[PDB]
């Protein structure tokens with residue numbers, strides 16, 4: 026909508042207070058004009074028609090519990106925008122400042138979030154398995170990263186290329202969490218998963234096997250569930266990325282860690298310059314090796330670590 030840029034205040038899903046960029050025209054709308062062509066947050070109103078209504082508020086204060094998921098979806102989209110811009114010189118998901126749109130209160134008790142090809146969508150969870158999924162920055166950045174992948178490598182969402190797609194989202198999701206720097210970790214979705222159980226998460230990058238995901242190629246899932254195991258086999262690549270950043274010895278193979286920034290640089294380069302729709306894990310290794318060579322040189326520690334990490338997970 027046409028209006029003037031204003032600044033509201035509210036609380037997010039975890040009861041934390043934050044400022045949000047809004048637009049004023051009769052009502053205060055969840056419309057951030059300060060980033061690219063804007064960030065727009067909508068209310069799906071417990072239904073499944075998308076996007077629903079541009080979020081409108083009478084007084085520019087967002088402290089109702091109904092408000093909380095919207096506050097977080099909006100705020101975290103802005104953080105993710107800032108990460109891509111400041112860290113990788115990328116303007117929104119398409120690289121040309123495309124508008125970022127999110128819908129919250131999708132369906133009733135919906136325990137998931139997704140990119141639907143055009144926008145992000147977040148359920149409120151059932152209160153048992155999940156609370157409102159936009160409460161997790163790693164979740165928000167995970168979904169927005171799907172948009173990035175779609176516009177770049179375009180990895181097909183099935184089998185090995187699908188697992189790479191998923192891993193990229195977990196990786197950047199985590200890197201965004203580290204960038205905002207509020208109790209970051211290498212787990213996915215801990216902030217919004219199982220309110221009754223402390224210390225767990227949906228998936229682990231440091232130790233995929235904790236939640237029954239493979240951590241080595243020999244353990245790859247080859248069935249047809251989960252689009253041929255896109256959320257399962259991603260564990261193999263998640264583990265590799267973790268090793269590249271943090272180092273360690275895995276099934277007897279040692280990796281010298283090079284840190285999160287270099288990890289981000291190598292994978293961002295692979296994603297935008299080398300990966301294709303049909304890339305398999307082996308092609309990922311080659312893409313990451315070439316990225317590292319471009320950035321740091323053929324004989325660098327960075328190249329050696331990429332190689333070691335892929336070795337550790339049994340990807341040749």
Ligand SMILES: [Ca+2]
Nearest residue numbers: 082084086087
């Ligand atoms: Ca209000």
Ligand SMILES: [Ca+2]
Nearest residue numbers: 163210212213
């Ligand atoms: Ca996390």
Ligand SMILES: [Ca+2]
Nearest residue numbers: 218219220222
């Ligand atoms: Ca929990």
Ligand SMILES: [Zn+2]
Nearest residue numbers: 167171191194
């Ligand atoms: Zn995903």
